């Protein structure tokens, strides 16, 4: 419910001693958590809002020149002097133009000249900063209640929406009939907003690297500049022309909006118009399932016929969902649901919507289950009018293992060492793997920062070749592994 | 506290070469004794103002 059909849906199964599980939430993904004797819940990070950001620097993308002035001095008499050179609104440059009797000078040679035009910014892009303590993550928690409309995720009306802030490490959501769920999220170890800028330019915003943003070759103003006219490196947006060493002119280069768009190729776009809400990045949380209980476990099984109102459908994740209308009496009853084999000798599938129940007779119910690979039968109801719905899955367990391995590898390529936090139960191997990943990721990020995916591919090919042509078996293997991982990261990057 | 009718938390001790031992009476925390050696901090016989 609210998590089927996202295609970036992960299944966290089981909780450790203590009834907590580590889940990493991402924007555009959804996590569904299942544990013995506990309801299946759907979790989704649906908003990261940065509040009250302070502007760090203004950049000029579209300027103009006015009040152009020029002055010359006869050769070997020094430099020309312009009053306009006194204030920094005027962009100036000094140059030499040959002079003689024709111009008005008494001797021949290269006389100094200076051109000064007023510099005005017509359009600027503002880069803002936000403290890691001013973020407000929003998470929608959706129980698999089997409600009719629960499949439609976008609304999230009956899912509880909790706002996670760094002010309090613990967030408690009370799901009616299910108890409460406690989330201990870590907004501080997320996107590291101390090292990023919120660059907004003409009704579009980007989340950029702070050092990259401060390296931009455009005229800029300080974050707190009231006048708006003391632009720092104006020379990046004007060109001075002395073609034949006769006269000098200054012209304005042209609007840099398109060049800025090209420069922003690798950034993630964000929203800046109505609040600084940005839909990107992840959030590690700890899920406390202690106070979480199944709903309607005190009801009795339904004694009546069920009719299918929406045919069985296969989700993108190897699960099936089906909506069933109820027709018997005892309105608040439990739906008898099981995925058997053909002879009904034993149960093959695993219900994902644990404890389906029909609360109201008229209201249909959506049940999701995970059938096994091959042939399975979905039996629904008691024998008189019992529904037996055949299903085929078209897959293999080896194929599922490959898919899961590739999905975990991608998660490692995206979250780095935070991948080891996903569905972690605090195992010793998990800790050691995460620490080793931190070490190797720090080394790799040092060695591979700032390059493009093509450079990553080239470096990986070179390293693989060097490892292959290495006398040492140990060094050969290590170099080949490094090259293969680098090639994978180059293939899976720029996204 | 801005109310200056009572002024606390501001103990300053002057240390001179003659009186290089002095105690601060930090209210509520007892007292602290500083046994300083001003005669070795700077050789003012080899310095001009």
């Amino acid at each position: 419910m609210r998590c089927i059909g996202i295609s970036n849906r992960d299944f966290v199964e089981g909780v450790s001693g203590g009834s907590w599980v580590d889940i990493v939430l991402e924007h555009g993904s959804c996590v569904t958590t299942m544990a013995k004797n506990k309801p299946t819940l759907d979790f989704e990070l649906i908003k990261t809002e940065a509040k009250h950001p302070a502007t760090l620097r203004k950049y000029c993308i579209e300027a103009k020149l006015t009040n152009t002035t020029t002055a010359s001095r006869c050769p070997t008499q020094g430099e020309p002097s312009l009053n306009e050179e006194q204030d920094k609104r005027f962009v100036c440059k000094h140059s030499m133009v040959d002079r003689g009797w024709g111009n008005g000078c008494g001797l021949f040679g290269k006389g100094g000249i200076v051109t000064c035009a007023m510099f005005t910014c017509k359009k600027n892009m503002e880069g803002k900063i936000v403290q890691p303590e001013n973020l407000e993550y929003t998470i929608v928690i959706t129980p698999h209640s089997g409600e009719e409309n629960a499949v439609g995720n976008d609304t999230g009306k009956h899912g509880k929406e909790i706002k996670v802030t760094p002010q309090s490490s613990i967030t408690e959501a009370e799901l009616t009939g299910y108890g409460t769920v406690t989330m201990e999220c870590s907004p501080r170890t997320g996107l590291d907003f101390n090292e990023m800028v919120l660059l907004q330019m003409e009704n579009k915003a980007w989340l950029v690297h702070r050092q990259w943003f401060l390296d931009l070759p455009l005229p800029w103003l300080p974050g707190a500049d009231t006048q708006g006219s003391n632009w720092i490196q104006k020379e990046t947006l004007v060109t001075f022309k002395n073609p034949h060493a006769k006269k000098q002119d200054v012209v304005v280069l042209g609007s840099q909006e398109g060049a800025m768009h090209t420069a922003l190729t690798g950034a993630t776009e964000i929203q800046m118009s109505s609040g600084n809400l940005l839909f990107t990045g992840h959030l590690k949380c700890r899920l406390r399932m202690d106070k979480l209980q199944l709903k309607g476990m005190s009801y009795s099984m339904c004694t009546g016929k069920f009719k299918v109102v929406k045919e069985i459908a296969e989700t993108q994740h190897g699960t099936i969902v089906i909506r069933v209308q109820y027709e018997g009496d005892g309105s608040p009853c439990k739906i008898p649901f099981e995925i058997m084999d053909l002879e009904k000798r034993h149960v093959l599938g695993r219900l994902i919507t644990v404890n389906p129940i029909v609360t109201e007779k008229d209201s249909p119910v959506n049940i999701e289950a995970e059938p096994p690979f091959g042939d399975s039968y979905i039996i629904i109801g008691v024998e008189p009018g019992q529904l037996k719905l055949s299903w085929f899955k078209k897959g293999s367990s080896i194929g599922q293992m490959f898919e899961t391995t590739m999905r975990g590898a991608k998660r490692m390529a995206i979250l780095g060492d935070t991948a080891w936090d996903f569905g972690s139960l605090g195992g010793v191997f998990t800790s050691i793997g995460k620490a080793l990943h931190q070490v190797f990721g720090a080394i790799y990020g040092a060695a591979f920062s700032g390059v493009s995916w093509t450079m990553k591919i080239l470096i990986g090919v070179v390293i693989t070749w060097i490892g292959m042509n290495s006398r040492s078996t140990s060094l050969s293997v290590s170099l080949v592994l490094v090259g293969v991982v680098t090639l994978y990261l180059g293939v899976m990057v720029q996204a | 506290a801005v109310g200056n009718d009572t002024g606390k938390h501001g103990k300053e001790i002057k240390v001179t070469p003659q009186s290089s031992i002095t105690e601060a009476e930090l209210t509520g925390y007892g007292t602290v004794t500083m046994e300083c050696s001003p005669r070795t901090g700077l050789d003012f016989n080899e310095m001009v103002l």
Partner: antibody
Amino acid sequence: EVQLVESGAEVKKPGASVKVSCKASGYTFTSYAMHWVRQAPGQRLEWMGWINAGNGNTKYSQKFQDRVTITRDTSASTAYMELSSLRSEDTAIYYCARDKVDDYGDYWFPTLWYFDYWGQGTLVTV
Amino acid sequence: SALTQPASVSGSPGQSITISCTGTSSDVGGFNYVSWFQQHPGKAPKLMLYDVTSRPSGVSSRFSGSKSGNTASLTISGLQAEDEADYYCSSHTSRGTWVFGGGTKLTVL
């Protein structure tokens, strides 16, 4: 007790000049900077400038910068605010508020509790 | 550059009333030099809050201060008759000067 007392009310004519004093007692006069804040009848408080009694340094508002002169008298622990070329707009109460300077004697960063103690307020009319 | 405050404010006795002091990124949006002054008629201003929230030693605990972005807020919880006064907001700006709010007149009735 830390009481700040200013000279009495005065009546001046437009184009004249007025000097207002603020006598500081109960605290080390040299340890605090003296601020002058004027409030026109039934209007907002307006900051004019401050004098650092420790060294006589001053900072005026861009407004009042050319007309106001602030001086201190370390001997009397008194501060003065000279306003020259009074105009009809200069009728207002002129308050004095203190703010401690740092241990160096330099008063550039104030204390969070600036203006904790005020003078009673001197009225000037033109 | 004066800090902007509502011209007037009124609250029934025993209620809670809030005052706003909107400034720029330099005065009240950049630094914690936010102070609230209470001035009864015919009297000098009285420091009610400082450092945004901290209140003087004699100042009641009914007075609470908050700051968000370029705006600092003062809240009164008891709304006693003695609280009816004129409240001024001030900030030490980035250029080293002091700016004051326009002042809000709080009335219990």
